Amino acid sequence: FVRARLEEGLNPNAILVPQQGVTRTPRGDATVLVVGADDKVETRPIVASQAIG
Amino acid sequence: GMAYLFVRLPSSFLPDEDQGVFMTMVQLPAGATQERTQKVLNEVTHYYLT
C-alpha cells in the first residue's frame, strides 16, 4: 500500500521557531523566550502547533 | 593565638588531590537531545584538546 505524500496549501505566515528553544511553562503552555529591543528577555507564551521537522 | 588561629583555620575535609583525572560535567536545557550534547561535547573536547 503505497504511501501518498499528500500536499496541501502552503501555510502563508508560518512562525517557524526551531524546537531548540521552546519549552513548556506551565503545564501545557509553550513559552518562547523572546528578547525584545531592550536586550531584556521576555517569556511570551505561544501555542505550539504541528512540529514540522 | 591557638584558638584564635584554630577558629579561623577552617574545619574542612581531605584535600583535592591531583588524582590525574578531573570530571567535566555538561548540563543542557531541559529536554535537549543527544545531538546537541555531542555537539557541545565536540566543543569541550576541542577546548580541552586544542
XYZ file of C-alpha atoms in Angstrom:
103
model
C 0.000 0.000 0.000
C 1.828 2.969 -1.354
C 2.452 5.988 0.838
C 0.879 9.141 -0.545
C 2.677 12.329 0.236
C -0.482 14.388 0.022
C 0.384 18.036 -0.484
C -1.810 20.840 0.791
C -1.749 24.559 0.546
C 1.286 26.498 1.650
C 0.835 27.923 5.180
C 1.390 31.543 4.214
C 2.579 33.056 7.511
C 4.399 30.317 9.366
C 6.205 31.298 12.533
C 8.839 28.548 12.427
C 10.800 28.855 15.639
C 13.299 25.987 15.973
C 12.495 23.361 18.571
C 15.731 24.075 20.424
C 14.231 26.981 22.376
C 10.560 26.270 23.022
C 9.737 24.886 26.475
C 6.518 24.243 28.350
C 5.800 26.701 31.146
C 3.357 25.942 32.856
C 1.822 22.537 32.207
C 0.730 22.567 28.590
C 1.766 26.126 27.708
C 4.727 26.633 25.404
C 6.937 29.640 26.147
C 9.350 31.001 23.646
C 11.762 33.291 25.459
C 11.863 36.222 23.037
C 14.194 39.060 23.922
C 12.862 42.447 22.827
C 14.654 45.503 21.504
C 15.717 46.204 25.111
C 18.093 43.266 25.262
C 15.828 42.030 28.048
C 14.257 38.614 27.570
C 10.500 38.231 27.712
C 8.883 34.841 28.190
C 5.862 35.439 25.998
C 3.756 32.276 25.770
C 2.705 30.828 22.437
C 0.570 27.925 21.305
C 2.919 25.293 19.883
C 1.255 23.738 16.849
C 2.359 20.956 14.471
C 6.060 20.234 14.961
C 7.416 20.299 11.424
C 10.882 18.834 11.249
C 46.755 32.598 69.445
C 45.963 28.878 69.324
C 42.178 29.118 69.328
C 42.409 32.470 67.550
C 44.136 30.648 64.698
C 42.047 27.488 65.079
C 38.688 29.247 64.704
C 39.980 30.886 61.518
C 41.597 27.618 60.474
C 38.563 26.219 58.638
C 37.405 22.739 59.669
C 37.486 21.277 56.177
C 37.911 17.732 54.859
C 40.550 15.880 52.785
C 42.338 17.974 50.151
C 41.587 17.786 46.449
C 44.411 15.603 45.261
C 45.636 15.958 41.703
C 44.466 12.427 41.029
C 45.355 12.671 37.362
C 41.758 12.987 36.198
C 39.058 15.576 36.511
C 35.423 15.158 35.636
C 33.798 17.688 33.328
C 30.026 17.897 33.589
C 27.800 19.360 30.906
C 24.119 20.140 31.508
C 21.990 21.201 28.550
C 18.494 22.789 28.689
C 15.515 20.789 29.815
C 14.773 18.284 27.120
C 17.767 18.854 24.894
C 18.561 15.988 22.605
C 21.658 13.852 22.282
C 22.714 15.537 19.042
C 23.181 18.839 20.838
C 25.109 17.349 23.754
C 27.587 15.599 21.463
C 27.866 18.884 19.601
C 28.687 20.610 22.886
C 30.987 17.721 23.693
C 32.523 18.377 20.325
C 33.448 21.841 21.633
C 34.530 20.830 25.133
C 36.713 18.099 23.676
C 38.081 20.606 21.148
C 38.590 23.007 24.047
C 40.397 20.546 26.309
C 42.499 19.342 23.411
C 43.337 22.320 21.226
